[PDB]
Amino acid sequence: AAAAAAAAAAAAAAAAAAAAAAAA
Amino acid sequence: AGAKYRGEFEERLKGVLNDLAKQEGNVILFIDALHTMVGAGKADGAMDAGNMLKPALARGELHCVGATTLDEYRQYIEKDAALERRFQKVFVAEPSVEDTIAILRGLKERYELHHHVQITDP
Amino acid sequence: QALKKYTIDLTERAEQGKLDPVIGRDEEIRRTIQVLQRRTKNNPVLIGEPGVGKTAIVEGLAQRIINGEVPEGLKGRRVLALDMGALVAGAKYRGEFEERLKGVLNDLAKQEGNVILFIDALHTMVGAGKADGAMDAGNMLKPALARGELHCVGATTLDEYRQYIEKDAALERRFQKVFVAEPSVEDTIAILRGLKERYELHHHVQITDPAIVAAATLSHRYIADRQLPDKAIDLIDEAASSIRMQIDSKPEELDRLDRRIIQLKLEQQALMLDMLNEELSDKERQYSELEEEWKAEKLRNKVTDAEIAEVLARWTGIPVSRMMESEREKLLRMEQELHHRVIGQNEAVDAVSNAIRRSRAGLADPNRPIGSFLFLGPTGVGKTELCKALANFMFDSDEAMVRIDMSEFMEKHSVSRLVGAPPGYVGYEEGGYLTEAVRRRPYSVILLDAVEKAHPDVFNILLQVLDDGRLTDGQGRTVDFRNTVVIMTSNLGSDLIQERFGELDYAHMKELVLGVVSHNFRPEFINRIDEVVVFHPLGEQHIASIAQIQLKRLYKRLEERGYEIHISDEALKLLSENGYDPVYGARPLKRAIQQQIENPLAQQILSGELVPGKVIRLEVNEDRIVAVQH
Amino acid sequence: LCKALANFMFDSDEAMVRIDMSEFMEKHSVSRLVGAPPGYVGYEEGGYLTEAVRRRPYSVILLDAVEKAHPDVFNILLQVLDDGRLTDGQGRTVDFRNTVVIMTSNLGSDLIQERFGELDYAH
Ligand SMILES: Nc1ncnc2c1ncn2[C@@H]1O[C@H](COP(=O)(O)OP(=O)(O)OP(O)(O)=S)[C@@H](O)[C@H]1O
Ligand SMILES: Nc1ncnc2c1ncn2[C@@H]1O[C@H](COP(=O)(O)OP(=O)(O)OP(O)(O)=S)[C@@H](O)[C@H]1O
């Protein structure tokens, strides 16, 4: 008589980063 | 640590909060690394410690003491204004030279008891 | 039940006398009553910035229901606060959470719609225990919300509303937005009158009504992040706490002297060369005298506006505390006090002393920063030293100031490195260098040495800084510069200033060099600067004084080296005649001192010749100056 | 005119994909008009153009004032006006081939106001 435990289920994401440029 | 099950962290933290209400205004709470308390119980669909402590903070019925670096304060607490206003900022400046000499004159006894050697005060 | 096990009644707390008195806020509580008496969407959310009484709006509506100050349909409604952490905290097994929540739903339906549900922190309703087996409590309340069955009063913050509710669109239409405005100042005064009675009867102290109106006006004035009526209340409660510590133990100055004498007692025990027993003797005598004076009046029992000034000065940093006599008597001598490190140049010394006196007296412009100066002088007449002397007066410290020298900013680029990168770019989450370090400590000195080197359209940042003293970095926020002391130093016409400081008065010189600056700046900028001073070079008397001060700091370094050294008075004349050139100011004097003193001195110390304690004199040769041993 | 077209065809002025091409003056707000590549911050919310056309394959796309854009947005418009498909960051493809891709500009304003007299339409 076991009961299936609901989980925590850790997740993930990321993030870029642009870069402008001078144009001499 | 002990909670990959849902609600097990919130169980512990609510039991702690009910004990702190049970202690009748006698326990001072110290929380080192308050920025660790921000991202604390961040499981998928879970309260952090902010969403559970945040009632008992601004009713005065918890006597937390935070201790955080200022760069951790900006990234981890000023990003969340709700828990950011629950505390009271206490700037703790780096001491000047003479007071630091005084503190080190206080702490000479500990190192003399530890290494069994003496220290020149110059 | 489930309502016994997961909710807390607010109206019980209001009838048991636990909740705060709730004042004002009339239109929003009327509008919450309007939204709660509907057919579908019985669900108000109380949006406001964090600290403006949203929990107080809900608890005040509960108190009005208890007092019967409500319309007829609201009479008897039990307002229940839901603890969502209580719902989440046990569902280890699958499906237990939804049993809990649906039992809550069935008991609320059995209660005939007589229970106004209040959920504090409505962003904690999404993400209420979802998993792989996600029901989340958002997708369970939602057909009960839309059918008006459930009278959920929300209370969420504003930046949390966009993040956690407006990223779920089917829920955001269930609720109705009540934009709680931050109050005025006079509304804050009334709120503090009710809470005055509350914190008086708690802290056993008394709060004069000028202490309230001072707390309201000054906390509107001098705090950038937090909001009314939060920070006003916190000033009141902390002033009450400070007065309770004063009444219980002893006044603060007794504690200052007590902790310093136990400190110095530990240190003189730690001295077992001293120069410590004088300070301990002074502090013990003064502690005994002030203890006897405290016995004479056997310092407060109330809370005044100067108490609020003490707490607000301990809160931000800005000196709002009323003048103790040591500080005020130090402050009157400000013109005299600058001339222990900047000798000569009386113009801007008197000017800046006037500026800081306009600050501390209270006649400053409360929308513009204190010091908005443009120093102008030839190369090496103490502009940077005048500003460091300001730092030394104002913060007891030479190198504690914001020195952002425009001498890196020679392009239109570096506006970015003073106000941070805009979003999506590289150092976005580091902010500006300037606005971060003024958001830390507002009361400071901005220093811009060599201000003309920059590309001329960098100063438009300082158009903002001198119009209002608000600057907006890349993270959108405003850092309020209305306590900063903005100082700029240049030398745009120092050939003309060395040429014509003689034979023309100060006024026409300021006129002509201001015409030159108008050729080098725009009328936008130079119309903002309060006083643009002119500096002259330094004649022989000033050179002698500078030589004395530099030899003082030389002897001051050599005291820890342990060599008390005298000088010939003729050797001062050799330094004057060997350091005199009116085109470069004071630094050729210093490097002539450097050579013609330190090179025989470091020659003879490194020679294995000198022993500490000897009377050493700087006797002259016919041209040299040498050190003798006596 | 573009509002008249959408308010004929769909009988609303704002029933149209208005893309204000003067907001895209960086190189990298192609991320806005197409989508986020995977794993990044707002990945599962598509673009504005690509999403709003894959909802409704028959609609009028107003690229408003195209000449203010950063010039490597014209890559995306090359693929659109080449074949009526586009590869957003979520990997899928859009069927643009039932849309009306109207762009606006004014790049000969001095010249057109000069020589609309004494010149025919071809010249
Ligand atoms: N109109 C008001 N009348 C009386 N007391 C008020 C009023 N507005 C605020 N307060 C009090 O001021 C404090 C406001 O704190 P809270 O309103 O609880 O913070 P908040 O406004 O809820 O923002 P969050 O969501 O808590 S971060 C409490 O002590 C309230 O009792
Ligand atoms: N009136 C003065 N009193 C004391 N020291 C002075 C005085 N005038 C100049 N000095 C010396 O000036 C040196 C630095 O002067 P600065 O203010 O840095 O030169 P400046 O005024 O900035 O001019 P420039 O164009 O920037 S080099 C210090 O080493 C001081 O010893």
Cβ count within 10 A of residue C551: 18
Q: C156 and C47 in contact (C-beta within 8 Å)?
A: yes
Q: What is the CA radius of gyration of chain C?
A: 34
Q: C185-203 and C209-221 helices cross at what angle (nearest 10)?
A: 130
Cβ count within 10 A of residue C618: 23
Half-sphere exposure of C589 (CA within 13 A, CB side): 29
- CB nearest B7 (choices: C89, C157, C225): C89
Amino acid letter, residue C7? T
Q: C532 and C374 in contact (C-beta within 8 Å)?
A: yes
Question: Which CB contacts under 8 angstroms, 24+ apart, belong to C358-367?
Answer: C360/C319, C360/C323, C360/C331, C366/C221, C366/C482, C367/C468, C367/C469, C367/C482
DSSP conformation letters of C423-434: TTSTTGGG--HH
CB contact (8 A) between residue B6 and residue A11: no
On chain B, the residues whose CB falls within 8 A of the CB of C234 are 88
Which subunits have 3 or more CB–CB pairs within 8 Å of chain C?
Answer: A, B
Which of C141, C137, C125, C124 is CA-nearest to residue C97?
C137
Method: cryo-EM
What would the two tokens of residue C509 be? 């010189």
Q: Going by C-beta distance under 8 Å and a sequence separation of 6 or more, which residues neighbour residue C627?
A: C565, C600, C601, C604, C610, C616, C617, C618, C619
Touching, A vs C (3+ Cβ pairs under 8 A): yes
Q: Which of C20, C28, C157, C189 to mutate to test the pocket of ligand 1 (most atoms within 8 A of CB)?
A: C20
CB contact (8 A) between residue D40 and residue A18: no
Q: How many residues does chain A have?
A: 24
B7 touches chain C (CB under 8 A): yes
Take atom 1 of ligand 1 and give the residue whose Cα is closest. Answer: C23
Number of helices (H) and strands (E), helices first, in chain A?
A: 0, 0
Phi, psi at C118, each rounded to 5°: -115, 115
Judged by its nearest atom, the ligand closest to the C-alpha of residue C589 is 2
CA dihedral (C322, C323, C325, C326) positive or negative: positive
What would the two tokens of residue D87 be? 């590869």
Half-sphere exposure of B13 (CA within 13 A, CB side): 25
DSSP C154: E
Q: Going by C-beta distance under 8 Å and a sequence separation of 6 or more, which residues neighbour residue C499?
A: none
Lookup result for tokens 């107080």: C56
Strands C44-47 and C176-179, by their bridges, are parallel
- CB nearest C266 (choices: B85, B91, B106): B106
On chain B, the residues whose CB falls within 8 A of the CB of C226 are 85
Counting atoms of ligand 2 from 1, which one is nearest the CA of C542? Answer: 1
CB contact (8 A) between residue A4 and residue C92: no
Which subunits have 3 or more CB–CB pairs within 8 Å of chain A?
Answer: B, C, D
Strands C485-490 and D85-87, by their bridges, are unpaired
Strands C402-403 and C478-480, by their bridges, are unpaired
Cβ count within 10 A of residue C158: 15
Lookup result for tokens 């900013």: C409
Phi, psi at C301, each rounded to 5°: -140, 5
Residue C232 CA to residue C182 CA, distance in Å, equals: 13
- Spacing, Cα C546 to ligand 2 middle (Å): 10
Residue C22 CA to residue C9 CA, distance in Å, equals: 17
Q: B25 and C104 in contact (C-beta within 8 Å)?
A: no
Residue C160 CA to residue C165 CA, distance in Å, equals: 8
Strands C206-207 and C176-179, by their bridges, are unpaired
- Interface probe, candidates C93, C412, C455, chain A, greatest A C-beta count within 10 A: C93
Q: Is residue C470 classed as helix, strand or coil in its secondary structure?
A: strand
Cβ count within 10 A of residue C333: 12
Amino acid letter, residue C12? E
As beta bridge partners, residue D94 has D86
CB contact (8 A) between residue B3 and residue A11: no
Q: Which run of H or E residues covers position C628?
A: strand C625-629
What would the two tokens of residue C187 be? 């509304």
Residue C152 CA to residue C95 CA, distance in Å, equals: 23
Q: ∠C473-C477-C483 over CA atoms, to 5°?
A: 85
Q: Going by C-beta distance under 8 Å and a sequence separation of 6 or more, which residues neighbour residue D55?
A: none
Q: A6 and C92 in contact (C-beta within 8 Å)?
A: yes
Q: A18 and B18 in contact (C-beta within 8 Å)?
A: no
- CB nearest B5 (choices: A5, A10, A11): A5
Cα C572 to chain center, whole Å? Answer: 46
Q: Going by C-beta distance under 8 Å and a sequence separation of 6 or more, which residues neighbour residue C80?
A: C3, C7, C8, C9, C10, C115, C116, C117, C118
- Spacing, Cα C572 to ligand 1 middle (Å): 69
Q: C113 and C155 in contact (C-beta within 8 Å)?
A: no
SS3 annotation, chain D? CHHHHHHHHCCCCCCCEEEECCCCCCHHHHHHHCCCCCCCCCHHHCCCHHHHHHHCCCEEEEEECHHHCCHHHHHHHHHHHHHCEEECCCCCEEECCCEEEEECCCCCHHHHHHHCCCCCCCC
Q: C93 and A6 in contact (C-beta within 8 Å)?
A: yes
Residue C303 CA to residue C305 CA, distance in Å, equals: 7
Q: Going by C-beta distance under 8 Å and a sequence separation of 6 or more, which residues neighbour residue D34?
A: D47, D49, D50, D76, D86, D88, D89
Q: Going by C-beta distance under 8 Å and a sequence separation of 6 or more, which residues neighbour residue C486?
A: C369, C371, C372, C373, C446, C448, C462, C465, C466
What would the two tokens of residue C92 be? 């280890």
Residue C435 CA to residue C488 CA, distance in Å, equals: 18
